[PDB]
From Swiss-Prot, chains A, B:
This is Adenylate cyclase type 5. One of its GO terms (molecular function) is adenylate cyclase activity. The lineage of its organism: Eukaryota, Metazoa, Chordata, Craniata, Vertebrata. Catalyzes the formation of the signaling molecule cAMP in response to G-protein signaling. Mediates signaling downstream of ADRB1. Regulates the increase of free cytosolic Ca(2+) in response to increased blood glucose levels and contributes to the regulation of Ca(2+)-dependent insulin secretion. Belongs to the adenylyl cyclase class-4/guanylyl cyclase family. The chain crosses the membrane at residues 38-58, 64-84, 95-115, 121-141, 170-190, 498-518, 520-540, 564-584, 638-658, 663-683, 712-732. Mg(2+) 1 binds at D267, D311. The gene is ADCY5. It comes from the Eukaryota.
Length: 970, 970
């Protein structure tokens, strides 16, 4: 009883979007959408004003101020409509234009209510109700301003009628009914305005929902794509994914040949000592600073960094665009690298130096494998460049004869004696030289603004809907729109039931109480209450038994059933509006006065009535002239009740505009036929009696009445009023339906582009499956290497110089990328491939890192075993004998992305180096694990064999184990 | 006087498209477009029938047959509208449906004209005029059928009025005026139907124009593309042209590497002897049969033909898709080739044989140059395969050790001793073996039909036009539509002037001659004649002085000015229609009869009038009751005249439907206001007099007249009739505008897709610039070879194995393709490139072959010199010393396209072989010409040097000359 009132007071806090920028953008949309609505509003208000002018002009005396004030109001409204139709009128003033329009309407009301003759409390109700409803429905004003305007118009009408008509004994009945009418009009308009203002905000807010999700999902893809990523390879792959090349006998290799390249390898001499003394953080910081300096020198020297191999930085000049100075570029890069590492030695105090090997030759460059794609280069010339680095001297650039030939002698070189330091350079007798000396929300709002601007509203409306039928041109669009369900239907039914209660109270106050009338109204009330109950069961499903819950859901979930119930409700209200009118008197009073006065009807004036008024007055509820039926002196309130019923058609906003039109035209035709055909005698009697009562009958010594009807025949006025209301309701229904359909259409485009974007994200993510820093204390790392793949890799013409071998390695990596895709390995992430080496780790992602069970370690051991079995399977099916080594270790690492312009995700730390040494020291077809990994796997019933003490570079002697089998399958 | 009548009789031949299939397709379009028009027609005819029913039902006695016949007509029309609204009703019956509708309309007319009471010659004119105009404008019937129906309806009305009203003395005036009205309606309808029936055919015919051009231009591109054309290269190039890679420092090379190929060269031993004995026709026929047989064997043996080199056929197995049996494929191809040439020797009697060389290795395959692109292969392995052919034995397959290794020993081989027969095979110590033993119009109409079906008409209408404004949604679309000009406007002005003349004759026949009336009509006639003159000046510009021609063009070329003139004309016609009505009497006759009989107006009946009928009759043209103004007994013909003016609005078809609506509503409002407000006394007086005259006054012994008005008050009927006409004219204007806009929209899509297709054709042709047989008696042929390019071509890694050399040769060919693009060389066509050899010819195209001056030969010599200068320029800028040889010869050749599945355009004949020997024998940096070319150039003041006698294979000793310089530039 009090909580409901508090909730109602909570409703009266005008909902507003908190952001004034977002509210401004919403207002810009709403004003762009409603500029046409505002101009249609102005045109309909002009039409109604012209109807009032015609009604008042049909009967003199013409008061000059009335005509002048109406003409001025029309002029102002037309000027404002022309300004608002010029595109240069700012939309922020449309709100002011609405308040100005309200003020114009206020002025029209005052002259509308004071001057008209004859004076009556029934005059001008119809146009006041019209203007109220139109301000609630066609005027885009704020809730507080709409309510204030409607209340002001109502109180001013009542006060004027009280001042002008204070002399009528029955004034109170009229006044009460006018109060009741205005109360009804004040209610229904709120119940029409408030849900619409809510659903449009909801439709706008729901749109901002989905669009944000769209942008959010794009935002998630962006950083992905960022950290993910050559643009040509990435765009080719993006085209190929669009090709959806399922059912290919081979995985597409992405290889391009480039010759005339120079390959530089540069290794940090002594780095393992620094990395054995620095912490993981200090080590990664020093490495990232050093490699960012080398990345800069490489960009300045037009050298493409290919990969980092521990301490070794390697880059190629002449990729992807061939260049003639590639050898000079690589030599200068190697010099600047040696200078940069000398500076790093001077700053850090760590005696680091750099060996640089440079070869010049040819390479195939491209990507292999399915996952963790990296751009790499393959050739015998790359192997020679590597041996040239390994045979180089620290602080010196060691170059091949090929490079020297590309240097055109621009650099002083000494014999490098590389074959004294490198076995490969000796066996191949490679002539070698040493160089001596030469806000997201603001972006969302901007994108949405641009889309609102580019998604023009009248064009989208005209494009995605048929011209006249207003159905979507696509049947599927209409089926989607027909699937949109309402939930406030029961609130509209409740409002209609309250309007019914007001109608009942009006009828009980004006119309004498009849047992037939009371029984009929009771029956209609019971039916309406039953329909309200059945509709509310949908809102209160949990409180009612299953069959009623199913019926209520089947009604509200069925737009057809709710539409039928609405139509039935409206038809019942109309029947209640006139079935009692059939109990009004129908005997002719005018022939009766003709018989008493014995005068001709065309000579009967209200004065001849006043001569015999002793016998017949409006105060008689008994059927005059011996009629058994009572007189109904105020039938215009049935018309007003029908106006209320027409207003009730407004409340069912979701009835089709054609369905509304048909229902309203049927109500109009039936009521006009009942007013004209059977009611004409009642109306003529009432018009005559009202005309006599309008005469302030006083000492009329002579039978000189004011004459002139002074009013347009009410039988003629009622149809015109009804037709004008039906027109305005049709235009309102058209605007409402066009608005809901446009909001729906934009919500659909937002959803379709979002679904397309989610598909594209899933697409790019599938192909990938097919400063940011983090310290991770417990990562498990696996290296799995094909030990004899270097024996299988033969660069002969018969083997496409080895490209076919690279295809087979791709398949070997693809199998491994498929295995590592098993849900049981979702805790594992592939880091990279390196030649024939598969690198995986576990525990790098908090969403899969079990702090307690270290399950990711079990998953990594099971993956290593499943890889060994996949290698067996590959050997069996490819007729090869690939022997695989796997090194496992556990421990802390630093993960991060290096390169602001080429973000590479990677992991650094002693744990990775130890894992790589466990792989390098692995026995073929055996899984080598560290002592810590042995301890973890043995604690989990893994079968592990002690390999013994292995000499690990940078660690000395380390105990190592073989993992020979998993725990028994439970 | 007679030639104009003959031209008019030529107009009366109903235009029909000759093809019944094309006419059927047009009818299918027209019926699909007009199915909605036909249903709107049915609805408007129903509306008019309901108006007639209301007018006749407003006054008893109700004759049962009238009601029954109208109800049956309505039923039939509704049934037909429902059938035609079912998609399953065949469109061929719509024409019959129209004739059936005419028959229904005919039935409605008969009962419309016989039964109505009271009888008058003015009754039912309005609905007859409506039905006539609607049949001319909304009924899609053939011209002969429309004319026959309108004439039948007119004659039947006149015959009925003559039979029923033969007793009325003034009948002739009414009958003449009815004749005039119906004459106008018969004319104006033709003048509306005939231009429309013409413009729609024109709009359809003009569309078949542009679409044919589109298809025609596609057709021209098709054979081009056919003869033009690997699909992968062609599609990549097609993508690249879409890239519009302007501003690239290098021309994109299209090279793909393939390893594991087998290369077969097969040369015809002795062919030069046959080619020295056969005629050009017999030679080309024999060659084309032989090479078509080899093309077949190559397709069967999965060997790709790369090129034909004189008598030599060469093909590669393993291209473009690698295959393991490539060596076996090439060996079997060489066997089948040796068998096929043995069979050709047996059939032709010519002792031809074949040498076959097969190597197995690697190739780069691709396209070089800019013009006359051919798929080729480059590698040392191709050169070795060629030397293996040249070192082969005729009738034997000579294979390398590489091929033998790929044959897995499946073939018996002997030592080939290739190094004994080929120097290259000896120097490279290549181990070699010899194998011992193992209708366009119908396509146009179909494409157009498919486009008509896919270009649905109600959807296209709803998509490319705004719902209410009917303006094209894009302003540029509206600007194109606004640029569409009228050309028959002057014919419409002439028709409106003829309608004006008919109106004048009606007014002069019914309305007494007044100096004011005659002067006003004269003034309007002079103004209208001036407007007609100014409009015809547009049609007859040549006959009138320049200022009037400029005014007329500025009016007709300006849709605003022509629209203004149309509006002005219509306003003048309306003024002529009623300004004279202001000279009709205005004193009230009814109050006058009230004064004469001393009875109350409500007691004045036609019997009381007949008591005083002696003083007031319709025969009095002198103002009754002392008015100085004459009586106008038939004011309904002003209404009918206004109907004619509304029909005149139809004639100005191009007035905007909103502009027409506004003009017609202004005409309606003004005329209805003049009928109701000032004329009411005149109309009441006329209704009373006409009611008395309708009574066949006879011995009415008692004042018991037939009573009952029997007619709806004409003041009330006229507004309803006018509003119905305005509605029907609005709907007609809406259908007309929607039709013209749809025809325009399809014409636009046809033109835009045609322009896009012409762009695509120009595009493909630019990239090309960037059995079919012909015997050509006099062709000039040039070969220009870079003599030392084989010394520059180094397949070292430092040169991308020669790809960079192939890029430089591309630029050399690009310069040559640019030079040969000079307009002065438009008589020259590049035939092909062959390695570093540029092949050009002149006189191969009859449109550029100067038969008399042989200018194409001069252009070819000037091209050869310009190439020598371009080679100098290239040498200067590339720091090379490329020496060019050019061989020129003239003589007959056979041109043709060989290969039904790979059409290659080429030229054969002794002239080409001699030109190629002049190039092969050319001195570096010298142009060698034959004696015939020397004779032609010397006759044209070219500077030529005698080289002397050169030994030409197959010709013996031939005199040859050097061309050292061109004729002096004039």
């Amino acid at each position: 009883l009090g909580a409901c009132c508090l909730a109602l007071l909570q409703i009266f806090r005008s909902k507003k979007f908190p952001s004034d920028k977002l509210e401004r953008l919403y207002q810009r949309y709403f004003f762009r959408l409603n500029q046409s609505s505002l101009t249609m509003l102005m045109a309909v208000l002009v039409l109604v004003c012209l109807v009032m002018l015609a009604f008042h002009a049909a009967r003199p005396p013409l008061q000059l101020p009335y005509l002048a004030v109406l003409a001025a109001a029309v002029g102002v409204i037309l000027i404002m409509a022309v300004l608002c139709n010029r595109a240069a009128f700012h939309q922020d003033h449309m709100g002011l234009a609405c308040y100005a329009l309200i003020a114009v309407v206020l002025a029209v009301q005052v002259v509308g209510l004071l001057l008209p003759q004859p004076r009556s409390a029934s005059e001008g109700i119809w146009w006041t109700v019209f203007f109220i409803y139109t301000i609630y429905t066609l005027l885009p004003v704020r809730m507080r301003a709409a309510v204030l305007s409607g209340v002001l118009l109502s109180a001013l009408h009542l006060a004027i009628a009280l001042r002008t008509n204070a002399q009528d004994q029955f004034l109170l009945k009229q006044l009460v009914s006018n109060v009741l009418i205005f109360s009804c009009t004040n209610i229904v308009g709120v119940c029409t305005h408030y849900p619409a203002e809510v659903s449009q905000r909801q439709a706008f807010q729901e749109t901002r929902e989905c669009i944000q999700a769209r942008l959010h999902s794009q935002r998630e893809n962006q950083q992905q794509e960022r950290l993910l990523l050559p643009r040509h390879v990435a765009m080719e792959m993006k085209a190929d994914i669009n090709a959806k090349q399922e059912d290919m006998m081979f995985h597409k290799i992405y290889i391009q040949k480039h010759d005339n390249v120079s390959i530089l390898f540069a290794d940090i001499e002594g780095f393992t000592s620094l990395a054995s003394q620095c912490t993981a953080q200090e080590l990664v910081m020093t490495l990232n600073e050093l490699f960012a300096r080398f990345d800069k020198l490489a960009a300045e020297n037009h050298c493409l960094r290919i990969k980092i191999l521990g301490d070794c930085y390697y880059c190629v000049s002449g990729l992807p665009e061939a260049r003639a100075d590639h050898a000079h570029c690589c030599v200068e890069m190697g010099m600047d690298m040696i200078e940069a590492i000398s500076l790093v030695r001077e700053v850090t105090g760590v005696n680091v130096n750099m060996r640089v090997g440079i070869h010049s030759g040819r390479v195939h460059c491209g990507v292999l494998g399915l996952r963790k794609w990296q751009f790499d280069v393959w050739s015998n010339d790359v192997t020679l460049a590597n041996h040239m680095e390994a045979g180089g001297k620290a602080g010196r650039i060691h170059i091949t004869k090929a490079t020297l030939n590309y240097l055109n002698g621009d650099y002083e070189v000494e014999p490098g004696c590389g074959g004294e330091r490198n076995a490969y350079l000796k066996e191949h007798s490679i002539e070698t030289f040493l160089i001596l000396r030469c806000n997201p929300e603001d972006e969302v709002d901007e994108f949405l603004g641009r889309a609102i601007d580019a998604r023009s509203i009248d064009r989208l409306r005209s494009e995605h809907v048929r011209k006249f039928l207003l159905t979507f041109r696509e049947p599927d669009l209409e089926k989607k729109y027909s699937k949109q369900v309402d939930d406030r239907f029961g609130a509209y039914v409740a409002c209609a039931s309250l309007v019914f209660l007001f109608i009942c109270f009006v009828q009980i106050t004006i119309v004498p109480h009849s047992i037939f009338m009371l029984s009929f109204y009771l029956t209609c009330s019971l039916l309406l209450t039953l329909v309200v109950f059945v509709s509310v069961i949908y809102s209160c499903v949990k409180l009612f038994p299953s069959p009623l819950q199913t019926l209520s859901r089947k009604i509200v979930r069925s737009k057809m059933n709710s539409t039928l119930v609405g139509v039935f409700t409206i038809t019942l209200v109309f029947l209640a509006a006139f079935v009692n009118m059939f109990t009004c008197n129908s005997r002719d009073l005018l022939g009766c006065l003709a018989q008493e006065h014995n005068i001709s009807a065309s000579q009967v004036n209200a004065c001849h009535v006043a001569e015999s008024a002793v016998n017949y007055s409006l105060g008689d509820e008994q059927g005059f002239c011996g009629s058994p039926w009572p007189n109904c002196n105020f039938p215009e309130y049935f018309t007003y009740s029908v106006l209320l019923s027409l207003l009730a058609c407004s409340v069912f906003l979701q009835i089709s505009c054609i369905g509304k039109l048909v229902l309203m035209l049927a109500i109009e035709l039936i009521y006009v036929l009942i007013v004209e055909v059977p009611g004409v005698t009642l109306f003529d009697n009432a018009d005559l009696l009202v005309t006599a009562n309008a005469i302030d009958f006083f000492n009329n010594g002579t039978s000189q009445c004011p004459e002139h009807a002074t009013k347009v025949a009410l039988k003629v006025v009622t149809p015109i009023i009804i037709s004008v209301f039906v027109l305005a309701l049709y235009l309102h229904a058209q605007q409402v339906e066009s608005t809901a359909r446009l909001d729906f259409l934009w919500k659909l485009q937002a959803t379709e582009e979002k679904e397309e974007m989610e598909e594209l994200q899933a697409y790019n993510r599938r192909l990938l499956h097919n400063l940011y820093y983090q310290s991770c204390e417990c990562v498990a790392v696996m290296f799995a290497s094909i030990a004899n793949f270097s024996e299988f890799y033969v660069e002969l013409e018969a083997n496409n110089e080895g490209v076919e071998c690279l295809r087979l390695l791709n398949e070997i990596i693809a199998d491994f990328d498929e295995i590592i895709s098993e849900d049981r390995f979702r805790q594992l992430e592939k880091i990279k491939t390196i030649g024939s080496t598969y690198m995986a780790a576990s525990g790098l992602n908090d969403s899969t890192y079990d702090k307690v069970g270290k399950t990711h370690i079990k998953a990594l051991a099971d993956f290593a075993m499943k890889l060994m079995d996949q290698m067996k399977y590959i050997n069996e099916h490819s007729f090869n004998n690939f022997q695989m080594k796997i090194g496992l270790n556990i421990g802390p690492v630093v993960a991060g992305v290096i390169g602001a312009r080429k973000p590479q995700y990677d992991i650094w730390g002693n744990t990775v180096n130890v894992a790589s040494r466990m792989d390098s020291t692995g026995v073929p077809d055996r899984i080598q694990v560290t002592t810590d990994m042995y301890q973890v796997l043995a604690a989990n019933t893994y079968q592990l064999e002690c390999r013994g003490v292995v000499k690990v570079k940078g660690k000395g002697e380390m105990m190592t184990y073989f993992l020979n089998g998993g725990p028994p399958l439970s």
